[PDB]
Scaffold this motif. Structure first.
Motif, PDB file in Angstrom:
ATOM      1  N   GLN A 118      71.991 167.251  22.056  1.00 21.06           N
ATOM      2  CA  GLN A 118      72.044 167.950  23.334  1.00 21.06           C
ATOM      3  C   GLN A 118      72.159 169.442  23.072  1.00 21.06           C
ATOM      4  O   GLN A 118      73.103 169.888  22.410  1.00 21.06           O
ATOM      5  CB  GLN A 118      73.223 167.466  24.184  1.00 21.06           C
ATOM      6  CG  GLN A 118      73.318 168.139  25.544  1.00 21.06           C
ATOM      7  CD  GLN A 118      74.723 168.113  26.112  1.00 21.06           C
ATOM      8  OE1 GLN A 118      75.620 167.483  25.552  1.00 21.06           O
ATOM      9  NE2 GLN A 118      74.922 168.800  27.230  1.00 21.06           N
ATOM     10  N   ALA A 119      71.198 170.206  23.580  1.00 19.96           N
ATOM     11  CA  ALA A 119      71.227 171.652  23.463  1.00 19.96           C
ATOM     12  C   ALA A 119      72.161 172.250  24.514  1.00 19.96           C
ATOM     13  O   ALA A 119      72.378 171.653  25.572  1.00 19.96           O
ATOM     14  CB  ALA A 119      69.824 172.228  23.629  1.00 19.96           C
ATOM     15  N   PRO A 120      72.737 173.422  24.243  1.00 16.14           N
ATOM     16  CA  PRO A 120      73.619 174.058  25.234  1.00 16.14           C
ATOM     17  C   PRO A 120      72.858 174.421  26.499  1.00 16.14           C
ATOM     18  O   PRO A 120      71.936 175.241  26.480  1.00 16.14           O
ATOM     19  CB  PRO A 120      74.134 175.303  24.501  1.00 16.14           C
ATOM     20  CG  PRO A 120      73.955 174.996  23.050  1.00 16.14           C
ATOM     21  CD  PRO A 120      72.712 174.166  22.972  1.00 16.14           C
ATOM     22  N   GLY A 121      73.254 173.801  27.610  1.00 12.20           N
ATOM     23  CA  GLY A 121      72.629 174.046  28.891  1.00 12.20           C
ATOM     24  C   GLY A 121      71.358 173.271  29.155  1.00 12.20           C
ATOM     25  O   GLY A 121      70.724 173.494  30.194  1.00 12.20           O
ATOM     26  N   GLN A 122      70.966 172.369  28.263  1.00 17.72           N
ATOM     27  CA  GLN A 122      69.752 171.576  28.410  1.00 17.72           C
ATOM     28  C   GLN A 122      70.108 170.094  28.473  1.00 17.72           C
ATOM     29  O   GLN A 122      71.271 169.701  28.351  1.00 17.72           O
ATOM     30  CB  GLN A 122      68.777 171.858  27.263  1.00 17.72           C
ATOM     31  CG  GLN A 122      68.392 173.320  27.121  1.00 17.72           C
ATOM     32  CD  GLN A 122      67.829 173.900  28.404  1.00 17.72           C
ATOM     33  OE1 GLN A 122      68.438 174.771  29.023  1.00 17.72           O
ATOM     34  NE2 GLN A 122      66.661 173.417  28.808  1.00 17.72           N
ATOM     35  N   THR A 155      70.649 175.082  17.347  1.00 21.12           N
ATOM     36  CA  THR A 155      72.070 174.938  17.636  1.00 21.12           C
ATOM     37  C   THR A 155      72.260 173.959  18.786  1.00 21.12           C
ATOM     38  O   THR A 155      71.676 174.131  19.861  1.00 21.12           O
ATOM     39  CB  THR A 155      72.680 176.293  17.989  1.00 21.12           C
ATOM     40  OG1 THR A 155      72.645 177.151  16.841  1.00 21.12           O
ATOM     41  CG2 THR A 155      74.120 176.131  18.458  1.00 21.12           C
ATOM     42  N   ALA A 156      73.079 172.936  18.572  1.00 16.03           N
ATOM     43  CA  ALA A 156      73.226 171.866  19.555  1.00 16.03           C
ATOM     44  C   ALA A 156      74.466 171.048  19.212  1.00 16.03           C
ATOM     45  O   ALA A 156      75.247 171.408  18.320  1.00 16.03           O
ATOM     46  CB  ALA A 156      71.971 170.993  19.607  1.00 16.03           C
ATOM     47  N   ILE A 157      74.657 169.951  19.944  1.00 17.76           N
ATOM     48  CA  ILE A 157      75.715 168.982  19.688  1.00 17.76           C
ATOM     49  C   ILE A 157      75.056 167.639  19.406  1.00 17.76           C
ATOM     50  O   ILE A 157      74.208 167.183  20.181  1.00 17.76           O
ATOM     51  CB  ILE A 157      76.695 168.875  20.870  1.00 17.76           C
ATOM     52  CG1 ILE A 157      77.115 170.267  21.345  1.00 17.76           C
ATOM     53  CG2 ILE A 157      77.915 168.056  20.480  1.00 17.76           C
ATOM     54  CD1 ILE A 157      77.415 170.341  22.825  1.00 17.76           C
ATOM     55  N   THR A 212      79.125 169.797  16.370  1.00 18.52           N
ATOM     56  CA  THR A 212      78.484 171.022  16.831  1.00 18.52           C
ATOM     57  C   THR A 212      77.820 171.716  15.648  1.00 18.52           C
ATOM     58  O   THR A 212      78.497 172.097  14.686  1.00 18.52           O
ATOM     59  CB  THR A 212      79.499 171.951  17.497  1.00 18.52           C
ATOM     60  OG1 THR A 212      80.152 171.257  18.566  1.00 18.52           O
ATOM     61  CG2 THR A 212      78.804 173.184  18.052  1.00 18.52           C
ATOM     62  N   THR A 234      75.641 174.931  14.559  1.00 19.13           N
ATOM     63  CA  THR A 234      75.229 176.281  14.930  1.00 19.13           C
ATOM     64  C   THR A 234      74.318 176.811  13.828  1.00 19.13           C
ATOM     65  O   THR A 234      74.785 177.192  12.752  1.00 19.13           O
ATOM     66  CB  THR A 234      76.439 177.190  15.133  1.00 19.13           C
ATOM     67  OG1 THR A 234      77.332 176.597  16.084  1.00 19.13           O
ATOM     68  CG2 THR A 234      75.998 178.556  15.641  1.00 19.13           C
TER      69      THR A 234
END
Ligand SMILES: *[C@@H]1O[C@H](CO)[C@@H](O)[C@H](O)[C@H]1NC(C)=O
Ligand SMILES: *[C@@H]1O[C@H](CO)[C@@H](O)[C@H](O)[C@H]1NC(C)=O
Ligand SMILES: *[C@@H]1O[C@H](CO)[C@@H](O)[C@H](O)[C@H]1NC(C)=O
Lengths: 264, 129, 108
Positions: free
Chosen positions: B38-42, B90-92, B124, B126
């Motif tokens: 999961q990407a930040p904000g996506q 960068t994602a989770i 996470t 980065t």
């Protein structure tokens, strides 16, 4: 995981086995051992009806006689033990097309154990699960691998004595149990040495790929039935012909005539 | 049932990242696992599947030749490896357990693939310079 | 899969979220729904197109017609603002596909 799936006949003169591994020819031999009495009541179980399921857990007593006139390889093996959970050790016997596997292990058996058969989308290969038989297996002690022994009647005799588990088997062509004699030959002797008090039969079920397999709607199978009887300590008189094969026997307690025959 | 992952990682572009997910004994040996990023904000994205007790691995169309999924029976760990890092990677990353039948997956029937009941805490990653 | 990016409603009502897909993914495979709070991992809500895992209330109901699916929430609660994901398996692509995020802003 575990899936929630859920008459008497005459035995005539079936259930005779070779008492020892000594060759004898044309002789009458008297022996005291655990035999299934002549003309006894043998319980007939319809495990699968037409689908109706009933596969109970039965006591072991002093030994077991098992019979089945099946040709659809639904019956695949057996489970033996006392509590059939992780507190005690249990024995499991499984057969397939190429081998037989015997394991003494501390199993955690499901309430309705069965062997699931999965078929590929292309019909070239399949697989067997064994995930619906038990949930765990630890502290595992004994293992054994050999060749499989499973209009065609199959008979088995199971005994557990002197720290040994003994299995005798016989296969015969027929056309509800028949009359006549067919002595069971020694199949295996296992140095296992455990408690056995109860047992249960192991069946095989196919997959219906239209509904999830965690319910009874995802598994299908044909009709299956078997015969169960129990052994008691009796004195028998066996006849060995010229070829070393047991062809007749007398139960020395069936009636006064048989007692008179044995006395002479 | 718990799924424990490794710690958060900070990596430079062009390097490689290795993410671990440690499981119990029975759960590792009787389940199939999926890796979801999961990407930040996506929205969520699928990366691949792994069945450690059948040695069968599926792969994503956009992650072929770049993502390597493997297992190791000792201490019950499942590993994911990412190479050729990009600036926007960068994602989770989550390791998730399928509640369906792995044998159904092996037979080719994926009508119930998409259920993931147990999830890890998330790693996470980065990727920056 | 396609679904609207946002939704809103008043507490205590019945809200719905749609998810439209092709015939090779939704029309052939079962649909699953997930809830993801902003500070935690996503949680499974509906599986096998109608079922709910233990701990999920009865306010969430899934339905499917043809090549589209819907999720309905009854008695909207002030602690139900999150992202809802429509997930399935695609045979052509041969992999999991998610429908995107839907945000419910509950005013009041
Ligand atoms: C049959 O059982 C043997 C012994 O475990 C095993 O090696 C073999 O893979 C089995 N075959 C199938 C199709 O399950
Ligand atoms: C059985 O295994 C458990 C852990 O799996 C162990 O603690 C126990 O000691 C074992 N049983 C015996 C009799 O040692
Ligand atoms: C075997 O099991 C029975 C029934 O559970 C128990 O009473 C008995 O003590 C056990 N046998 C031995 C020799 O400990």
């Amino acid at each position: 995981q575990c899936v929630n799936l859920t008459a008497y006949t005459n035995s005539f003169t079936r259930g005779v086995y070779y008492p020892d591994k000594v060759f004898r020819s044309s002789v009458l031999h008297s022996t005291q051992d655990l035999f299934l009495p002549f003309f006894s009541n043998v319980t007939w179980f319809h495990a699968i009806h037409v689908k109706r399921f009933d596969n109970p857990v039965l006591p072991f007593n002093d030994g077991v006689y098992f019979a089945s006139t099946e040709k659809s390889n639904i019956i695949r093996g057996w489970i033996f033990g006392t509590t059939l959970d992780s507190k005690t050790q249990s024995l499991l016997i499984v057969n397939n097309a190429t081998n037989v596997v015997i394991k003494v292990c501390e199993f955690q058996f499901c309430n309705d154990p069965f062997l699931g058969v999965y078929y590929h989308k292309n019909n070239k290969s399949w697989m067997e699960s064994e995930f619906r038989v038990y949930s765990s297996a630890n502290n595992c002690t004994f293992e054994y691998v050999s060749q499989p022994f499973l209009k065609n009647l199959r008979e088995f005799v199971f005994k557990n004595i002197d720290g040994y588990f003994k299995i005798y088997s016989k296969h015969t062509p027929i056309n509800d149990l028949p009359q006549g004699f067919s002595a069971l030959e020694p199949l295996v002797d296992l140095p296992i040495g455990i408690n056995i008090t109860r047992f249960q039969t192991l069946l095989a079920l196919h997959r219906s790929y239209l509904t999830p397999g965690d319910s009874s709607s995802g598994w299908t199978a044909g009709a299956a039935a078997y015969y169960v009887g129990y052994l008691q300590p009796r004195t028998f008189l066996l006849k060995y012909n010229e070829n070393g094969t047991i062809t007749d026997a007398v139960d020395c307690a069936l009636d006064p005539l048989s007692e008179t025959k044995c006395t002479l | 049932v718990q799924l424990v992952q490794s710690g958060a990682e900070v990596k430079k572009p062009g390097s490689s990242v290795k993410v671990s997910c440690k499981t119990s004994g029975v759960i590792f040996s009787r389940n199939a696992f999926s890796w979801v990023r999961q990407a930040p904000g996506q929205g969520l994205e699928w990366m691949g599947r792994i069945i450690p007790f059948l040695d069968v691995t599926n792969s994503a169309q956009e992650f072929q030749g770049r993502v390597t999924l493997n297992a190791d029976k000792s201490t019950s760990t499942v590993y994911m490896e990412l190479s050729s890092l990009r600036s926007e990677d960068t994602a989770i990353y989550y390791c998730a357990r399928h509640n369906g039948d792995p044998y159904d997956f092996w037979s080719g029937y994926n009508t119930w693939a998409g259920g993931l009941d147990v999830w890890g805490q998330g790693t996470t990653v980065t990727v920056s310079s | 899969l396609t679904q609207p990016p946002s939704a809103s409603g008043t507490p205590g009502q019945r809200v719905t979220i749609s998810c439209s897909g092709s015939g090779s993914n939704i029309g052939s495979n079962a649909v699953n729904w997930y809830q993801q709070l902003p500070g935690t991992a996503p949680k499974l809500l509906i599986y096998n197109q109608n079922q709910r895992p233990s701990g999920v209330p009865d306010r969430f109901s899934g339905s499917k017609s043809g090549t589209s699916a819907s999720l309905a929430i009854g008695g909207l609660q002030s602690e139900d603002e999150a992202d809802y994901y429509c997930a399935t398996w695609d045979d052509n692509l041969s992999g999991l596909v998610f429908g995107g995020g839907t945000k419910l802003t509950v005013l009041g």
